[PDB]
Structures are given as structure tokens and as C-alpha cells.
Amino acid sequence: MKLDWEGRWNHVKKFLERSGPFTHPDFEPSTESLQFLLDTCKVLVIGAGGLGCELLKNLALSGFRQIHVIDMDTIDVSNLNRQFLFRPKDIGRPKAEVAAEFLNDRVPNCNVVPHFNKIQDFNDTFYRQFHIIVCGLDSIIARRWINGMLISLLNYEDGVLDPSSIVPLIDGGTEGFKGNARVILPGMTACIECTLELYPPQVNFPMCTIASMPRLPEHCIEYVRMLQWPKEQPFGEGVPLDGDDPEHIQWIFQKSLERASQYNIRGVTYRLTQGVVKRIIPAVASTNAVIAAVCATEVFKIATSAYIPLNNYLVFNDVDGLYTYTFEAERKENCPACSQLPQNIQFLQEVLDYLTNSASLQMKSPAITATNRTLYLQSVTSIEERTRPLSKGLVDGQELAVADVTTPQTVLFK
């Protein structure tokens, strides 16, 4: 037997071997594009959770074979209602590893290579190896980080972008019966940093409310988790709250009801306690399937130039009937991440606050360094202290350099 049985790729070939009226301008039919897909196109899937499993199936059945997966998580029982590449026996094993295992077994000659890592563990060298990158993660930080990484791979010769250095980034997200998908062509279209409004950071209750004006069950649970557990140390000095530890949640649940009684707040339940502690986002298989399908279809289009790619940002909502909405996000010219020209601040804790509390730069814990000397940092307890003196050594044109956990890049601002 040969690798590919009769008619195996019949459902894919038709879009590569036939000319068409809606084809991509640079598209030419060929009985050799499928080969590039099977033999050389390298695709990296960021995330083995939710979209990840769906994404590996999609690419595999679309003719991709050189696929890599990155994930730092272990299989959890709650993954099982939608992460179909894992079974109860797999609970505890690395998702990345199990995803490749299952995929390689189900799709005959696929070659999914796993990586029990977080995306921050790798550098340029690792990512340049890929033609396309599909991210199906859930944290905004990761999305921004990988967004910065690909931007960094860009090579401009005299202000003339080198197309070969562009690594398309397909990004997808889900939330219950809502989801989003988007195509980012680093240096050509809107990047993640260009549309921060589209990525509203998760809820983070205000201190005053949590510590002195609780009104909702969630505030109580939050208080116990964020203040009482650190103060008291229920399970021993240094013992960190383990959101998955049954005993820890029962503890949090009891102290929560305690605070709720004192303020006559109803609703503290074990389920709600788990929700808050783990900052759980409801999820189902169907919504992940829909969004991963849009994303994979776009990865396919970008690889074979079969059709022009999603302009750039699609939204899906399944609540009242269903619909998809697509629009073109605009590349912001004043972009901190993808613009080519350094930022222009016009003014120490004046910039650290500006770089944090702003909306254009929602940096989380920026480390500011003057031309050639660390001014402030935060990554070192002495740095955050010794250097802390925030307390009002620069001039006019000086080129400052910020650094956050949000990007692999050093945003140059003047």
C-alpha cells in the first residue's frame, strides 16, 4: 500500500487543481500545491486546549502534515466535554503530547510534533521556521506576546518590508456561544496591538468593593481568595492556593459564606466559588468547532493562495439564531507594536503610569530603561525598590525603551 489511498484528498484537490472565477489573483491551478502542503508547509498551532484539538483535526484533513503544537497544560477532567483528543485515561498527561499522539494515530501519515512549553520559552529562531501560525489560546497576554514575536520577525530594507519575512497569524477565540477569528498579516494589516479595544481584559474587581463594599456573592469569594488566603495560610505557610485542590475550594467556599452572612449577600455556592477562583469561562464543543473551522479554512487559503483571506476580523454569535459578522480592522499608524517609528511621549511614575493606565498601551508592569541605564524595572525586589526611586536624569530627545510581559519586543518611545 502507498501512503495515500485512492481518492484520499479528493475533497481538497479540487480547490488546487482547478481554475475558478473567485480564485486568488496569484493563484494558478496545479497538481503540485497539495504536495507543498503534505511535504513542506510548516504550521504551528499555539494551544492544545479547545480550539487546538479542533485546529489539529482541521489542518490534518486539509492536507497539512508538518504541524507543531505548543501547550504548557495537563489534561483536566473539565476539558473532556469539548477537547475530544483526550479521554478520561489521559487525565494528568500533557495535552500537547496527547493531542499529537491521538492525531498521528487517527490521520495515517500526519506528523504532529508536540512541545510541552509555553510560547515565551522560544525565540525568533524557533518561530521563523514556520510559514503560518494559528493561535487558539485564551489569555490576551499570550495573543499579544505572539503578536509581538511575529512583528519582530519583520525585516524592512530601507523602509521596504521583505515579504518573505511575513509570517501570517491566524487568531481565534471563543466564549460560550460567541467567538471571533481574524487574519493578521504582520506589517500589512492591523495587528493585535492595533485593535486593543477588541481585546477587553477580563474582569478584575476594584479593591474598595472587594475589601469594603461587597454586594455580590462573587465579591465575597474574591475577598477570600485575594486577601484572606494570603493573610491566613489555611494550609501552611507558603502553601499557595490551588484552584483545583478540592480541599482548598471547600475552604474558600466556607469563608465566603462567612463574609456573605455578615453582609447579607445571597448566592455563595460551591460552583460559583470554583468559577471565581479559576476565573472559569463557560465553553462548549460547537462554538470551538465553528471558530476553528473559520481559522483552519483561512490557514489553508493563506498557504495555497486558493482564495483571498478573511478581510480580517470575523465574529460568530449562536445565542439568538446565529450569524457571522466580518469587518476590516484598520492598521493604526501610531501603533506601539507594528509601526516602524518610535513612540512620541511628551512629558518617573509619570511614564510607568502612562505606560500602564493608558488605553493605547495597556502594558502590564513596564520596565523603563533610559538610553543605556536601567531606570525602573519589575521582574529584582531591590530593582522594584532600589530603582523604585518613580520619585521625580534625562533630557529632551532621549530614546527611552520600555519592556513588558505583553511582548517579546522592546518598544522604543521618545
Binding site: 486568488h24 489573483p25 496569484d26 500545491s33 507543498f36 513542506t40 508547509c41 510548516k42 521563523r128 521556521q129 514556520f130 510559514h131 503560518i132 515579504p163 518573505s164 511575513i166 501570517p168 498579516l185 500589512m188 494589516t189 493563506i302 498557504a303 495555497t304 493562495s305 483571498i308 483571506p309 478581510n311
Partner: peptide, 13 residues
């Protein structure tokens, strides 16, 4: 999109 994009169907350097 001002300029159209096409992926080279060759291996990277």
C-alpha cells in the same frame, strides 16, 4: 489591504 500577499510554496531559509 493596499498590497496583496502570497506565500512562497518553498521551504524557508
Amino acid at each position: 489591504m493596499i498590497k496583496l500577499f502570497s506565500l512562497k510554496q518553498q521551504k524557508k531559509e
